[PDB]
C-alpha cells in the first residue's frame, strides 16, 4: 500500500517552551521580592551582594500529537500515522513520556550548570490557578525516574490527556529558586556569535534559550540498544547523539529514519520500548522527508 515516505513530511512541536528570564531573590523574602539580574560586561553575570537566590521563570505549551503534522504529500502516510497514534492512545495514554517529561522538571535538569552549588533548589509548577505543591529537586537524581510521586502523576495525566486529544492546550508555568549563595556566578545561556562569550539577554535581563530548556526536558530516552553498558538518559534525537560523549547510541537499526519505515511501510508491530522513541521524535518535531 506504501513504499516510501513523502517528499514533504514535517512535524511541529507538541511541547513549546518559553525563553527563560532570570531574577535576583532572597529565599526568606522570596514570595514578595524580585529584582532583575542584568548582564555585567567577556560576560560574567554575577549576582549582587544582598540576594542569594536565582528565580528562573519559564512556561510550557502542550499540544496534541495527532493534530501536529504540517506537511504530508500522501494521504496513505497520513492515515498510517493516525492509526499508529490511535494504537498508542489505546495501549498507554502518552503517560510514560508524560511522567518522564515532568520528571525532567522535577529533577531540575533545566538548570544545566546552575544545579551544583546549592543547598536547596525548589521548583513550583503552576497549571491554571492550581499551584501544585512544591518540588524538592535535590532529592531526585539525574539518572533515575520516579513513577510513584503524586504531583508528577497529576501533571503527567494532564499532559497525557493533552498529548492524546482529550484536551486542546495545557499551559504549564514553572518557577524555580536556586540558592547558589552570594557573589557567585549564575551561568546563563550563550549566544552563537558567528563572526568572546556574549550571553543571552531577554528583555533587559539574563536568561536561557528555549532550545536548551527543551533539550533538558527531552532527556527521557532510556530505550537505546545499550542501556546496560551506558546507563544515562540521552536527549531523544533521531540519530541518537549524546553530546556529553561521542557514542552513537542509535546509529542505524534503531534510528527513527529506519524505524518509521518499519511501522508504516513493511508494516510490522514493534516492541513498546522503541514505540516510545518514535512517538517522542513525533513530539520534538523535525522535517522527516525522503528525497524522491
Amino acid at each position: 500500500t506504501l513504499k516510501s515516505r513523502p517528499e514533504n513530511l514535517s512535524f511541529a512541536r507538541c511541547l513549546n517552551t518559553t525563553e527563560a528570564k532570570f531574577w535576583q531573590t532572597d529565599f526568606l523574602k522570596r514570595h514578595t521580592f524580585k529584582l532583575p539580574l542584568l548582564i555585567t560586561d567577556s560576560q560574567s553575570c554575577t549576582l549582587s551582594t544582598e540576594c542569594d537566590t536565582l528565580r528562573i521563570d519559564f512556561g510550557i505549551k502542550v499540544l496534541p500529537v495527532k493534530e501536529s503534522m504540517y506537511s504530508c504529500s500522501d494521504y496513505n502516510y497520513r492515515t498510517a500515522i493516525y492509526q499508529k497514534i490511535d494504537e498508542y492512545i489505546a495501549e498507554d495514554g502518552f503517560l510514560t513520556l508524560a511522567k518522564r517529561y515532568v520528571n525532567n522538571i522535577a529533577n531540575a535538569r533545566f538548570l544545566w550548570r546552575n544545579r551544583k552549588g546549592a543547598e536547596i533548589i525548589e521548583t513550583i509548577v503552576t497549571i491554571e490557578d492550581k499551584e501544585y505543591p512544591s518540588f524538592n529537586s535535590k532529592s531526585f537524581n539525574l539518572d533515575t525516574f520516579v513513577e510513584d510521586n503524586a504531583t508528577i502523576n497529576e501533571i503527567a495525566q494532564q499532559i497525557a490527556d493533552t498529548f492524546a486529544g482529550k484536551r486542546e492546550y495545557l499551559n504549564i508555568y514553572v518557577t524555580c529558586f536556586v540558592k547558589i549563595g552570594c557573589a557567585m556566578e549564575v551561568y546563563p545561556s550563550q549566544e552563537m556569535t558567528f563572526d568572546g562569550k556574549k550571553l543571552f539577554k531577554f528583555e533587559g535581563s539574563a536568561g536561557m534559550h528555549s532550545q536548551k530548556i527543551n533539550n533538558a526536558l527531552r532527556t527521557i530516552d532510556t530505550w537505546y540498544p545499550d542501556y546496560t553498558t551506558y546507563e544515562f538518559p540521552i536527549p531523544v534525537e533521531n540519530y541518537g547523539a549524546a553530546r556529553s560523549i561521542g557514542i552513537p547510541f542509535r546509529p542505524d537499526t534503531k534510528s527513527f529514519y529506519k524505524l518509521i519505515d518499519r511501522m508504516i511501510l513493511k508494516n510490522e508491530d514493534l516492541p513498546i520500548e522503541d514505540k516510545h522513541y518514535v512517538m517522542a521524535i513525533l513530539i520534538r518535531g523535525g522535517m522527516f522527508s525522503k528525497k524522491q
Partner: protein, 155 residues
C-alpha cells in the same frame, strides 16, 4: 595498597572535567595534606594521545588497605551524589597506571620556543585554583609506570 571506585556519571549536564576540577580535586588537595604520604590517583580510560579525556571513572588507590578509610572520600563527596557516586569497596591495586605532572612550559611574556614544546601537553588538563596567592592554571597529566604520589596525587 587498594583502591576505591569514584565514578563521574555520564551526562548530568555539566561536563565531567568541570565536576572533577570544581568538586573532587580541591577535596583531594585538602585531604592529601592530611594523608602525608599521598595515597594515589589513577584515571582508567585516559584514551589516546591525539585527543583524550581524563575519563569517567577516577580510581584513587593507596599504599595501604587501611589509609583509604583514613581519608574517607565517601561522605566527603556526598554533596555530589547526583554527579559522583562513591562505591564502598577496596581491592589490592598494583594493576593501574601511575600519573605524572608533565610541565607545559610558560607563555612568551612570562619569560617561538614556547609553542614547539607547548604543543605536546596541550592536547588531561584538570584545572586548579590556588589555595595560595591565587593565579589559576590547569595541571597536565600522562600515563607512566614507575610504581610507588607526592603533592596533589601525582608523582
Amino acid at each position: 595498597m587498594f583502591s576505591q571506585i569514584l565514578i563521574i556519571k555520564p551526562g548530568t549536564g555539566i561536563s565531567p572535567n568541570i565536576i572533577i576540577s570544581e568538586d573532587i580535586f580541591p577535596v583531594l588537595h585538602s585531604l592529601f595534606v592530611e594523608h602525608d604520604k599521598k595515597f594515589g590517583i589513577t584515571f582508567p580510560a585516559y584514551s589516546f594521545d591525539k585527543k583524550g579525556h581524563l575519563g569517567n571513572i577516577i580510581e584513587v588507590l593507596s599504599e595501604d588497605k587501611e589509609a583509604l578509610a583514613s581519608l574517607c572520600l565517601e561522605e566527603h563527596l556526598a554533596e555530589v551524589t547526583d554527579y559522583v557516586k562513591v562505591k564502598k569497596e577496596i581491592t589490592f591495586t598494583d594493576d593501574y597506571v601511575l600519573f605524572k605532572r608533565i610541565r607545559e612550559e610558560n607563555q612568551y611574556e612570562t619569560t617561538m620556543h614556547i609553542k614547539k614544546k607547548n604543543q605536546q601537553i596541550f592536547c588531561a588538563y584538570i584545572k586548579v585554583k590556588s589555595a595560595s596567592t591565587g593565579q589559576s592554571y590547569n595541571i597536565f597529566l600522562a600515563p607512566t609506570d614507575i610504581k610507588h604520589f607526592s603533592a596533589y596525587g601525582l608523582l
